[PDB]
């Protein structure tokens, strides 16, 4: 139940970082946090983070967009990108720099 334009003084403040990065409401209006790789989405869990795909049967599961291995500013590579990005944010969460993309794999 949306209404046909996006009402912005009415969205709700932020967190400086989200867990599952960030996304828009179920209306595409507000900015809010979404949810992790491996996390619960729609209706009631609401909407992955950013690159993340919500996945459903044919209630979902959050995957990760892109599924190929990447090489961050650490030593560790990473799954897939949404890792790394993850691993990126926790870094910030805790006063560090990113955790930035340096190849792919290698
Ligand atoms: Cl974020
Ligand atoms: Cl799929
Ligand atoms: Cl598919
Ligand atoms: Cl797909
Ligand atoms: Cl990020
Ligand atoms: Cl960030
Ligand atoms: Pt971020
Ligand atoms: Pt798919």
Do not use: K
Request: hydrophobic residues 25%; negative net charge; glycine residues 12%.
């Amino acid at each position: 139940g949306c209404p046909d334009r996006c009402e912005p003084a009415r969205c709700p403040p932020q967190p400086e970082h989200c867990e599952g990065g960030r996304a828009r409401d179920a209306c595409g209006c507000c900015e809010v946090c979404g949810a992790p790789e491996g996390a619960a989405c729609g209706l009631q869990e609401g909407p992955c983070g950013e690159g993340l795909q919500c996945v459903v049967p044919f209630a979902g599961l959050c995957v990760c967009a892109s599924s190929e291995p990447v090489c961050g500013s650490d030593a560790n590579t990473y799954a897939n990108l949404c890792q790394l990005r993850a691993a990126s944010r926790r870094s910030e969460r805790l006063h560090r720099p990113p955790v930035i993309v340096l190849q792919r794999g290698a």
